[PDB]
């Protein structure tokens, strides 16, 4: 896996910010796109843009072929059984909302439990809050270990026979944790519950096998995996998606429409109201082709390389706290002793280094960590050890600078 | 308004389909994009793609500036009062669903009436069906005149003091009708109802003034107005949007998140859960700049030119039925005597001409017209009289061909 060759594919990387070479370390907020994706979008709008699913004229046929072929690439990419289980959405937030609306709100009675965790992104928290509110059910949290991982025994004790939904992240956008999704699916099924995986931060960086994970729902976002903004995927087990009613209504999702009553389409289109995100989904398919040609396991190896490197070099700086486990994905969330993370991020951007500062859409986790805010540096398949060197050097310079005041 | 100059801006137009020069006459299903829009997307992904609203590093600031500047361009484009009234969505279908979910389902009791029309696109029908189902309210239809327009007196007789929502199209994607949205807003307000305009087919072709129309909600789609797929707009009167609860939940739309309770953001972000359609909205802003530089009233004049031309030349063919009024937008929905519309569309595509055939997501209207399917040809700012000449010549050739069998 030659990473110079990969970086030459991303035009955004080759610029300067405030006089310094750009060091983009914020892929966990959003990733950059290779020429293959951008040029897929260009070819779409230049050559075969048309509305889909009325194979009547040639460009319509070409566009439909592109869109549904993107659906098939997504099916292969996460090892789903059928394209009917692959639904295009606006992003992970919308997919989780669709499960919360069309599954939770229809299958929850008082006394039923929805269990999540303290490390969950807001997208995997608030929909469940609102659903238990609407149904009178109960929201429960799985406690975290002091290194920010989840114990299987805490899972077994928190999920009871009254649990109908367990909702959990695959990889934490803050701690870097990789959660035991497979074992947790077994534990949820033993108690008669479904399991909903927020896969927003796992899909870009590691292979997904929904058959091996046996997850009932899986949600992912294109913009974090080299794909266009505005598009993501909901995977649901076909059997579950058959009995869920649509979250949105309109054209393209109906069969017969009367004055007062309508019947829906078969899956997947039952859950795709309106003109779909045609260009965005085709570009996501291009992103998938790109990743598969690099190789997802090679990308995982690269990220483990960079994460081990980052942890070791961060431990070479005194006065820096890193949050989370040692086994992790390619991100380091941290703080500097007596320096606010926003300030760290500002000085790093003055050095041309892009990190995030704030709560990372995980306020309960921030409270659990006993901090109000954090800095985070996130790595992807275009990032190098030289860039982490620059990060830790700038962190040292920042701490020297704030000591001399 | 030089239309050769405009056509040279759309690369998709300059190709051949089945040996013939492409004649794209299906803009009412979806429009084509000028270089300015496609290159706006390219510049975004090549130079300043980053997640928005955490103005922490330079690319994040550039992307936030682009996204919110797109919001401001949309505000100017439809003469809304405040950016807080401009909400980015997936498209018109989603915007209408958001009104049906967050307004209708919270303000409808049994005995309340939701009135629509027989000419409405499915996107402006089924959400209301489901909302009156969920609330026990009543769905009513405004009857149509025999030329497919709406009488103001039929409006006054159908909307009663028990009506809370009137939902109506601005321009009909099938009949070409321009509905009296302004007078209808007055009539709905006199009865204490709100008015929801499906503006999907008016926004691309004519100026929108929500202050002059006094609509309470207005929905539009970017892909029909030279913009990227996957993005549209909901406009609501700020006062109404303040009291509506969000349709989706997650990050970017919250203020404080507790274990069980959260508070929302101010408008507009209260209604934008998750990472937004960044590139799509910026490209929509580019589309708006492009149209404004051509001039919307000039585009309206061009479409009236082409529509009058098309009607006159269609009346020069015997055995063709055109549906709808004489005063219309730039589209002609029709049928050939004893030729099925799908067949017409197929032979026209063999001539390289792109039309649609089917029900055009308006099944109640099809039943009202007493037909099962239809052919439709739709014009936009890149279409010429020569292309309509080709259309009517190919229609004549089609009818001769199906007579000689």
UniProtKB/Swiss-Prot annotation, chains A, B:
It comes from the Bacteria. PROSITE patterns: AA_TRANSFER_CLASS_5. The keyword Secreted does not apply. InterPro entries: Aminotrans_V_dom, Aminotrans_V_PyrdxlP_BS, Cys_dSase_SufS, Cysteine_dSase, PyrdxlP-dep_Trfase, PyrdxlP-dep_Trfase_major, PyrdxlP-dep_Trfase_small. The keyword Signal does not apply. It is an enzyme of class 2 (transferase). Type II cysteine desulfurase that acts as the initial step in the SUF-like Fe-S cluster assembly pathway. Catalyzes the removal of elemental sulfur atoms from L-cysteine by using the cofactor pyridoxal 5'-phosphate (PLP), resulting in the production of L-alanine and persulfide. Activity is stimulated by SufU, which acts as a sulfurtransferase that receives sulfur from SufS via a zinc-ligand swapping mechanism and transfers it to SufB. Homodimer. Interacts with SufU; this interaction induces an opening of the active site pocket of SufS. Interacts with frataxin/Fra. This is Cysteine desulfurase SufS. It comes from Bacillus subtilis (strain 168).
């Amino acid at each position: 896996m030659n990473i110079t060759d990969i970086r030459e594919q991303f035009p955004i990387l080759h610029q300067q910010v405030n006089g310094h070479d750009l060091v983009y370390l914020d892929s966990a907020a959003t990733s950059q796109k290779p020429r293959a994706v951008i040029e897929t979008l260009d070819k779409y709008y230049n050559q075969y843009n048309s509305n889909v699913h009325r194979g009547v004229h040639t460009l319509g046929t070409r566009a439909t072929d592109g869109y549904e072929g993107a659906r098939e690439k997504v099916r292969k990419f996460i090892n789903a059984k059928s394209m009917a289980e692959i639904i295009f959405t606006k992003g992970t937030t919308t997919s989780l909302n669709m499960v919360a609306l069309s599954y939770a709100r229809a299958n929850l009675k008082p006394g039923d439990e929805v269990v999540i965790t303290y490390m969950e992104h807001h997208a995997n928290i608030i929909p469940w809050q609102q659903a238990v509110k609407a149904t009178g059910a109960t929201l429960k949290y799985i406690p975290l270990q002091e290194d920010g991982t989840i114990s299987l025994e805490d899972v077994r004790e928190t999920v009871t026979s009254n649990t109908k939904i367990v909702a959990v992240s695959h990889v934490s956008n803050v701690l870097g944790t990789v959660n035991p999704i497979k074992e947790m699916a077994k534990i949820a099924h033993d108690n008669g519950a479904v399991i909903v995986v927020d896969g927003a931060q796992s899909t870009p960086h590691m292979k997904i096998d929904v058959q091996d994970l046996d997850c009932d729902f899986f949600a992912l976002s294109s913009h974090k995996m080299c794909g266009p903004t505005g598009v993501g995927v909901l995977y649901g087990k076909k059997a579950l998606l058959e009995n869920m009613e649509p979250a949105e209504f309109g054209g393209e999702m109906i069969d017969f429409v009367g004055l007062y009553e309508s019947t829906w389409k078969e899956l997947p289109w039952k859950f795709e109201a309106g003109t779909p995100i045609i260009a965005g989904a085709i570009g996501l398919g291009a992103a998938i082709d790109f990743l598969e040609e690099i190789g997802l396991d090679e990308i995982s190896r690269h990220e483990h390389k960079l994460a081990a490197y980052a942890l070791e070099r961060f431990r070479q700086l005194d006065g820096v706290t890193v949050y989370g486990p040692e086994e992790r994905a390619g991100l380091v969330t941290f703080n500097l002793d007596d320096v606010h993370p926003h300030d760290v991020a500002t000085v790093l951007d003055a050095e041309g280094i892009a990190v995030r500062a704030g709560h990372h859409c995980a306020q309960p986790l921030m409270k659990w960590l006993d901090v109000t805010a954090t800095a985070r540096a996130s790595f992807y398949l275009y990032n190098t050890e030289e860039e982490i060197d620059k990060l830790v050097e700038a962190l040292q310079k920042t701490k020297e600078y704030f000591t001399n005041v």
